[PDB]
Symmetry: D2
Subunit: 726 residues, 4 copies
C-alpha cells in the first residue's frame, strides 16, 4: 500500500495555521462547515476511497500503466478504448478563460443582514436578520491570463453570488469605487489597450506599456481610476484587506414602489492594507500564487475573510444635488457627503473541493438582480447587462450554464425553455409554451408584490431622442482625481508619484509620457512636477499655470479615500518570520510564540536548511523553510531571537532577509545578541522607531512589536531606505 | 385557469389504445412503470404544475407577454434581462445531428437472460436469469436528417444501451446481418455516395440517385447489403417487426479465459413484417412520423415491443471452416450452418419524458463493452471503435457526455479524469493521478477475475507486416447476394426486382444503370434479366453466359433469410380501418369491435367528417378520423360494415380508400350491402381469396378476416393489382 | 480510367431543360455567369481534375481503400494517421441547423434599381439604375428540420443578402405580409407550440397538432397569419411563384434627413401560383425535394427566378 | 478539434500547406474551401476518379508505411527491456 504507515499523507480535518498541514479540498478539510448551497452540491460530489478505478462507462480497469499493443514492443492498437477514452478526456480538459478577470480565487461563505431593510427594499435576502444567504465569492485581477501572477499592480474584481430564496443576485464589483470609462461601447478599446499588445502578446499582468498610456492620454475620463491603480490600492496585501464597490448607482425598490438610489460597498473587517511596489513585483516572481494561497490558508486556519456590506443611499429627489452625475461610473460619491450605512456581514468560511468545477466554471453577471433591486441608466452598466449572458454562451459551452452545479439556484426554477447543449434537466411538462391549456398554464406568471412576487421594472420616465451622445454632465475629468490625491497621506502621495514614475519610464514612445504628464498637470501641479522630474521632463509655463479643478461639493479631501489615514489595522491572520540559529534561547521563543498566539498571529520558523535545530534547553524546533525558500516578501514582520548568533551572523541569506524586510517597511524585532544585526540595516546605537530591541523577548518586547504590526508598515522609515543596497 | 373544467386536456395514466387519448411524457402516462435507470433519472426530472414561472436564475416573472420598452409603443431596452435570457436560450437550442442515423425513435425497457451463460462468458448481465438489466433502445434510419421521414427505403439502426452492474454495454446493430463495406477506411466514401449530393443537397432519405449507384457499381462488396435494402427488408412495417443484428463477429470470454466467436441477433417476438414500396413512399408524405408514432403508441397501449437476444456461436478451432471469412462484415453466417441460440428477452415498456434530453442526447458506441466480451479484427469494427468517441466530443459539446443523464452508468464510476466543458461531477479526491500515495492510490486497478474483475483483452496472436491491404479471403462478392436471392419467396423476388427497377430509373446517367445491371448478372441471370427489361436494357451474349457464383457451404437457400417463407404472423398491436356510414348495422359493429379487442387488434372508426353518426339502433358512434385524414396506408386491413351504403357508395374518398388498400395487398372485409364495393375493386361475383364477404359480420367473418391479418398481406393478389388505377 | 468513353458522365456547360443533363455545381454548369461576389469567392473554390488525392496536410495518399493493420487480417494500428484524419473529419461534419427555417434552398443573382431613389433614401444600392448589387437569396420553410420536405403547408422565408458598396444589407422576409405574433418576447412560445411536441418530437413539417392550435386559440393576434397559412398561400407551386414581404415598417432616410416609413415587397415576375393540398401532401412523399430541385433546374435552364 | 473549433483547423491560414491539397472530405464547422468536384467520394466515375491516389515512388509518390514485422499477442504490458 502506497500511503505511509504513520498516516502523515492525510491533513487533519480541524483548523490549522498556514504550513502546518498539506492543504485539502474544502469538504475534506472542513466536513461540518455547511450552508444550504454546499449541502445542495452533495448530489454531484464524488469520493474515491475504496472504489475501483473505471472508465467513464463504469468498466473496471485492470492495467492503468500500459497501452494495448501487438507484442510488448509492438504497435499500439486502435481497439484500446481504455487508452483512448483517458487521452480524449485529457485532450479536451481546457475551456476558454474569462475575457477579463481570468485570474481569480474563490471561496464559499454566507451573508446575513444586521436588520430588516423592508422600509427601503423588498429584496427577500435583506428582509430579516435571521435570513442566512449562502454566497460564493471570486476575487480576481483584470488584465492577466488565468496563469498570470497574483500581486501585479491592477484593479481587483470582487464578485459575490447570493443564492437567495427569490433568485440568484450577483454583485459583480471591483476594489475601487469608479471605473476607467464612461460608456460600455468603449470597453473593447480600453481592454485592448491594457491587455498584452497584439503583435507580440507582451506584457502580461502590467499596464507598463505604450498602448495603455496612449489610450489614457487621449481619454481623460480614465484618469480617476488610473490614480487609484497607481496608488497602493493597486497592490493589496490580501483579498481580505481591500475594499469592494459595485461602482454603479443602482436602485432599491420597496413594497410601496418607492425607488432609492444606492451604491454598494464592501468594508474589510480585517482592515485596509497594501504591499509596496518593489515587494509586490518581487512577490510575482517568488510566489505568483500568493493571494490565492493566502485566501485558501486563511480559511483553513479559521481566519475567515469577513466584509460588511454597506449602502450609500440617495433619495430620488436628490438626483441632481451634486457637482457630478450619479450615473457617471468615473465619479465616486464621497462618504463625507453620503455616508455608508452598514447593512450586514459576509463571512467566507469554506474552500472549494475542485478549483475547475466550482471556480473556473462559476458565472457571475450584474444583470442577475432580484425583486427589490433595479438598474439605472448608467451607460457602462447598461452595456454590461448585454455582455455577461453573451460571453457565457461560448466560455461555458451553451445556454445551460445555469445547470453547472456551482451556478444553480438553490430556490425553485421552472419555465418553458428547453434543449441546448448539455441539457441536464428532463422536463415533464406536456407544454413547452404559454399560454397553454394542456398543463393549465403552469408554470404561471406571478404579479409583482411585497414578497414572492414577480419582477417588474421601476417605471422610470424616459424622454429624449435616439442619440449616440455622451451626457455633457459626464464631461469633467479632473476634480475626482484631485480629490483622491489630496485625501492621501504624504507617503501614499509619494507611492503614487513613484507608481507613475516607474511605469511611464517603460513607455518607449516619449511623446506618450509627455502627454500623460500634461494630464497630471490638470489634476495637481505638485504631482505633475514630481513625476516630470523623474522622467526628465520640464513643465512649460502654460502647464505651471493650469487652474486646479474645483472642489467636489466644497470638499478638498475625504480621509475615507486613503488606505491609511484612519487606523483600522487587525493583526489576526498575519504572519511573522522567526529567524533561528543552532542554539536558540528557548525562553525567547516561548515568550514570542505565546504573545503571537494570543493575537492570532502565525509564525514561520526559518533556518539555512530543512530538518530541525535544538534549543539551548534541548527543545527540538522543526524548521518550516529556509531563509531563501520563504523570503521576507511573504511575511508581515521579522523577529530574531537570541542564541548562537555567530551561526547566522555571516549568513548572506539571513542578512538579506533583514535588509529586504527593512526596505519594505516591515517591523523588525531583535532580542539579545540579535542586536548585532543592526549593523546590516545601519541602525544607530540609540535605536530607531520600527526596530524593537531589548535584552530578551519579555512581555513588553512583544507588545511593542505587535503595536508596529497593527500599524502595518513603518512609514517613517521611508527616507532611510534609500541608502540600503537591497 | 385555461384548462377545460371536465379535465379532458389530461390523458388517463393507464394503458389506452392508439388515438383514444393525447399522448404524454412516459413518467406522466405510466408513473408506476419503473426500472433502476428510470429511478436514477429522478434527480433530474423537473415538473411544473403549481410552480411559478421564473428565469433560469430563479427570479419570478410577472409579465411573460411583453418586452421592456420606453413607452408602450417605444423601443425595447437593453436592460430587459428576462427577454434576453429567454431568447438566448431559444437561439441556442440546436445541437449537431448525428452524422448518420440522425432520424431515430427511442424507448426505455429491460432485459433478462433465460439462463446463466457463465460457461461461455463472464459478462455479469448474462450471469443470472433473475438479473434484470435496464435498457434504452434507439431505432433509426441511416441517410436522412433528424427531420426526414420514417418509412423511406433504407437500412434501419437498432441500438441498445444495457446499463449493467459492471459497466454500460452498447450493442449498436442494424436490421440486416451484413454491412455495405469491408474496411472502415471506406465509410466516409460510402456515406458520402448515399447522402444527398454535395452541390444541391438532394435527395433526402433515398438511395435513388447517381452517386450511390456509381459507388455500388465500382465496389461489388456492397452488393450483398444492396440486395437486402432493395428487398422489402428495406421498408419495415414497424420497428417491432424487423430483425436486429450486431453484424460483426465479436468474442465471448469465460472465466477460464476461453474465447468463443459470437454474432448477435435480435428476433422480433411480434414477427417479421414489411410494407410494399408504393405504400411506404406514400406514407413518407401522409405520415413522415409513422414508425415514431407507432412505437410510442404501442408502448402507451401496453403492446410492448419484445425481442429475443440470440447468439450464433462458433468455436475458435472453427474460424476457417467456412467458404467466407468470419471477419468479413459483408458476409452473413447462414442459420442453417450455425443456429441462433436463444439467450434472453428485452421488453421496451416506457417512452421518454423529453425527446431531446433522452433520445437526441443519447450516445451509443460499439466500443462500450464489458468484461466477458471482446472484439475481433473485423476491419470495419476496428475503425468504428475510433469513430463513436470522436464524433460525440462535437455532437454533445465536450468530453463529459457520459454525465448527460441518459448516458450515465447506473453502476459506480471513479477515475482520475478531470475538467472538460460541462463538468458536473465535483471530485474530492486529493489526487488526480496514479500511482499516488496522498490518497492511498484510490481509486485502484482491479485484477481480472470471474466476477467484478478488471477488463483485460483476450491475448490473440498477431503476426504479419504493417500493411494497407485487404485480406484475399474477403475478395468474393456474389455468392452471398445469390444465397439471399434464392432464399426469397417468388413475391419477395418480384419486390426486389421492382425495387432495383424503380430506383435505377432515377439514375440520370444511363451507363451507371447498365453497370449495375452487369453486376446483377454476376449474381443471378433471372434477376438481371427482369431488371434489364424494366430499364429497356438488353443483356449481351457475354452477360448471359457469366457463370453463377458457388453455393455457400453447400447451401442453395436458407429460409431464415426470407421475411415471409416461414409464417410467424402476430396480429396483436395491428390496426383495422372501419368505414362507417350514417346508419350502420349496430350488430355488425358489436361483432367486429369485440372480435378485434379479443385479439389485441386496434380499430379506427372513419367517416366523411368528424363528430358522431348514429347506428340503426340509436348507438352513437364517435368518429376517429376522416377517410382522407387517416388513409389506408396507416392500417393493416379494412372492414366495411353493413348499413346505408348509398351514404358512402359515391364518396370518391371511400372508394379510393378500398382501391388503395386492395393495391397494397391488405385484407378487406365487406358485410351485407357493403359488398356493393366489390365493383370498385373489380372482385368477381363468386369472390376471391383475401376479400372476406358475408350477409353480416357474424359467424366466421371475423375469424376469416383475422386469419388473413395473421398472414400480413394477400400475396396471391399481386397479379390482379396491375390493372386497378390506384 | 473509370469515366465512360463517350464523355456522358459530364453535363454540358450550357443551359439545358430539366432532366436533359445531370445537375452540377454552378461554377461548372455556368462558368461565364459572374458577378462581383461570385468572383470574390474564387480564393476559396477548389477544383479536383488532375490533382493527387492527399491528406489535409498535403501528403499524397497511395491506398485510400484500406486501414493500416498488423497482417492483412490483423488489427488496425493507432499510427494510421491517414485513416484517423479522414474519419475525424467525417465525424465532425455536422453543425447545428438553424433554430427556425432550417429547410431552405439558395442561389446567387443580382439586383438593380429602375431609377435613383435619392429623394427618399441615401442607400447607395438604390442610388443608380446602372449600379448592380450582387445578391444571395435563401428560400425556406419555417417549422421542419433541414431534412424535412419542401411542399408542406407552412409559411415560407425569403431572405436576400445584398452585397452593397456601403455594407451588407439583409432583407429577411417571408411570403405573407404579416407575422403570427406581436412582441418578440413571445417568439419562443409560438415556435415551441408550432414545432414537434417535446415528449415525442411529432409532427414534422405540420401545424396539424394540439399545441399549435392550443396557442392559436389562446392568442387571437395569431389569426391573421393563420388565415394566410390555411389558404393556398401555405403551399406555393415554386419559390418562383410566391410573394415576399419584409412585414415590418422600416424607415428610409434621405440626404436631407427626412424619414419615410416603408414596407418592402417582392413581386414574382413568374406570377403567383400554389398547389392544392392533396397534391402538396402527396408530393412530400414522392419528392420531398421538389422546390429545391425546381429552383436549381430553373436556373440550369435559363428560367431565372425574377422578382420586383 | 476542441481547441481550434472543429475539423477545419488546417484551413486557418498559419496551418495551411503551401503545396496542393485535394481530397473528398467536406463540411465541418468553419468550412472555408468551396469544393467544386461533382464527386465527394471515391471510387467515382462522374469526375473520372479525381483526385486520384498515387503509387509510392522515389519522388512525389504516395505515402506507404514501412512493412515492419509485428509478432506477439495483444497485451497491455511494458517491455522488460524498458525496466
Ligand atoms: C463598473 C464596471 C465593471 C466592473 C466592476 C466589472 C467587474 C467584473 C468582475 C469582478 C468580473 C469577474 C467575475 C468573475 O470572477 O468571474 C468581470 C468579468 C467580465 N466583465 Fe466586467 N466589470 C465592469 C465592466 C464591464 C463592461 C463595461 C463589460 C462589457 C461591456 C464587461 C464584461 C465582462 C466580461 C465579458 C467578463 C467575463 C465574464 C465571464 O466570462 O463570465 N465588464 N467584470
Ligand atoms: C456494422 C456496421 C455498422 C452498424 C451496424 C452501425 C450502426 C449504427 C447505429 C445503429 C447508429 C445510431 C446509434 C444511435 O441510435 O444513436 C450509428 C451511428 C454512428 N455510426 Fe455506425 N454503424 C456501422 C458502421 C460504422 C462505421 C464503419 C463508422 C465509422 C468508422 C460509423 C460511424 C458512426 C457515427 C459517427 C455515428 C453517429 C454516432 C453518434 O453521433 O453518437 N458507423 N451507427
Ligand atoms: C417578421 C417576422 C419574422 C420574419 C419575416 C423572419 C424571417 C426569417 C427567415 C426568412 C429566416 C431564415 C434566414 C435564412 O434563410 O437563413 C429566419 C431565421 C431566424 N429567425 Fe426570423 N423571422 C421573423 C421573426 C423572428 C423573431 C421575432 C425572432 C426571434 C426573436 C427570430 C429568430 C430567428 C432565428 C434565431 C433564425 C435562425 C437564423 C440563423 O441561424 O442564421 N425570427 N427568420
Amino acid at each position: 500500500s502506497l500511503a505511509p504507515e504513520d498516516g502523515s499523507h492525510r491533513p487533519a480535518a480541524e483548523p490549522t495555521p498556514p504550513g502546518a498541514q498539506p492543504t485539502a479540498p474544502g469538504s475534506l478539510k472542513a466536513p461540518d462547515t455547511r450552508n444550504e448551497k454546499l449541502n445542495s452540491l452533495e448530489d454531484v460530489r464524488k469520493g474515491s476511497e475504496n472504489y475501483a478505478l473505471t472508465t467513464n462507462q463504469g468498466v473496471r480497469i485492470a492495467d492503468d500503466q500500459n497501452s494495448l499493443r501487438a507484442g510488448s514492443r509492438g504497435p499500439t492498437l486502435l481497439e484500446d478504448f481504455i487508452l483512448r477514452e483517458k487521452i480524449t478526456h485529457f485532450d479536451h480538459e481546457r475551456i476558454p478563460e474569462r475575457i477579463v478577470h481570468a485570474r481569480g480565487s474563490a471561496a464559499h461563505g454566507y451573508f446575513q443582514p444586521y436588520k430588516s431593510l423592508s422600509d427601503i427594499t423588498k429584496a427577500d435576502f435583506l428582509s430579516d436578520p435571521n435570513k442566512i444567504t449562502p454566497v460564493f465569492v471570486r476575487f480576481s485581477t483584470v488584465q492577466g491570463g488565468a496563469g498570470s501572477a497574483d500581486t501585479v499592480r491592477d484593479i481587483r474584481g470582487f464578485a459575490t453570488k447570493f443564492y437567495t430564496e427569490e433568485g440568484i443576485f450577483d454583485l459583480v464589483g471591483n476594489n475601487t469605487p469608479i471605473f476607467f470609462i464612461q460608456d460600455a461601447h468603449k470597453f473593447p478599446d480600453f481592454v485592448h489597450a491594457v491587455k498584452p499588445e497584439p503583435h507580440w502578446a507582451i506584457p502580461q499582468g502590467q499596464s507598463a506599456h505604450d498602448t495603455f498610456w496612449d489610450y489614457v492620454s487621449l481619454q481623460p475620463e480614465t484618469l480617476h481610476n488610473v490614480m487609484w491603480a497607481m496608488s497602493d490600492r493597486g497592490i493589496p496585501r490580501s483579498y481580505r484587506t481591500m475594499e469592494g464597490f459595485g461602482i454603479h448607482t443602482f436602485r432599491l425598490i420597496n413594497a410601496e414602489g418607492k425607488a432609492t438610489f444606492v451604491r454598494f460597498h464592501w468594508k474589510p473587517l480585517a482592515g485596509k492594507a497594501s504591499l509596496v511596489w518593489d515587494e509586490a513585483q518581487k512577490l510575482t516572481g517568488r510566489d505568483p500564487d500568493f493571494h490565492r494561497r493566502e485566501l485558501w490558508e486563511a480559511i483553513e486556519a479559521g481566519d475567515f475573510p469577513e466584509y460588511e456590506l454597506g449602502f450609500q443611499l440617495i433619495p430620488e429627489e436628490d438626483e441632481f444635488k451634486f457637482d457630478f452625475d450619479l450615473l457617471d461610473p468615473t465619479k465616486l460619491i464621497p462618504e463625507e457627503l453620503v455616508p455608508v450605512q452598514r447593512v450586514g456581514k459576509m463571512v467566507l468560511n469554506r474552500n472549494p473541493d475542485n478549483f475547475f468545477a466550482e471556480n473556473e466554471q462559476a458565472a457571475f453577471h450584474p444583470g442577475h438582480i432580484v425583486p427589490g433591486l433595479d438598474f439605472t441608466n448608467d451607460p457602462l452598466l447598461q452595456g454590461r447587462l448585454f455582455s455577461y449572458t453573451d460571453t457565457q454562451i461560448s466560455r461555458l459551452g451553451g445556454p445551460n450554464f445555469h445547470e453547472i452545479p456551482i451556478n444553480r439556484p438553490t430556490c425553485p426554477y421552472h419555465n418553458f425553455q428547453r434543449d441546448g447543449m448539455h441539457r441536464m434537466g428532463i422536463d415533464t411538462n406536456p407544454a413547452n409554451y404559454e399560454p397553454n391549456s394542456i398543463n393549465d398554464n403552469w408554470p404561471r406568471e406571478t404579479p409583482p408584490g411585497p414578497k414572492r412576487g414577480g419582477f417588474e421594472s421601476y417605471q422610470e420616465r424616459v424622454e429624449g431622442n435616439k442619440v449616440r451622445e455622451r451626457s455633457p454632465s459626464f464631461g469633467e475629468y479632473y476634480s475626482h482625481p484631485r480629490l483622491f490625491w489630496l485625501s492621501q497621506t504624504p507617503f501614499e502621495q509619494r507611492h503614487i508619484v513613484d507608481g507613475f514614475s516607474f511605469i511611464l519610464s517603460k513607455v518607449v514612445r516619449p511623446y506618450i509620457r509627455e502627454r500623460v504628464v500634461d494630464q497630471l498637470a490638470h489634476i495637481d501641479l505638485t504631482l505633475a512636477q514630481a513625476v516630470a522630474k523623474n522622467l526628465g521632463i520640464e513643465l512649460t509655463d502654460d502647464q505651471l499655470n493650469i487652474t486646479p479643478p474645483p472642489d467636489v461639493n466644497g470638499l478638498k479631501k475625504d480621509p475615507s479615500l486613503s488606505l491609511y489615514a484612519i487606523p483600522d489595522g487587525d493583526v489576526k491572520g498575519r504572519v511573522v518570520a522567526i529567524l533561528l540559529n543552532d542554539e536558540v534561547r528557548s525562553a525567547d521563543l516561548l515568550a514570542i510564540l505565546k504573545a503571537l498566539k494570543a493575537k492570532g498571529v502565525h509564525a514561520k520558523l526559518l533556518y539555512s536548511r530543512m530538518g530541525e535545530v535544538t534549543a539551548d534547553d534541548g527543545t527540538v524546533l522543526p524548521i518550516a523553510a529556509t531563509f531563501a525558500g520563504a523570503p521576507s516578501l511573504t511575511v508581515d514582520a521579522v523577529i530574531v531571537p537570541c542564541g548562537n548568533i555567530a551561526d547566522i551572523a555571516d549568513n548572506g541569506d539571513a542578512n538579506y532577509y533583514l535588509m529586504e524586510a527593512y526596505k519594505h517597511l516591515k517591523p523588525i524585532a531583535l532580542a539579545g545578541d540579535a542586536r548585532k544585526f543592526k549593523a546590516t540595516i545601519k541602525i544607530a546605537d540609540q535605536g530607531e522607531e520600527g526596530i524593537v530591541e531589548a535584552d530578551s523577548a519579555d512581555g513588553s518586547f512583544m507588545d511593542e512589536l505587535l503595536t508596529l504590526m497593527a500599524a502595518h508598515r513603518v512609514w517613517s522609515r521611508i527616507p532611510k531606505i534609500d541608502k540600503i543596497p537591497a
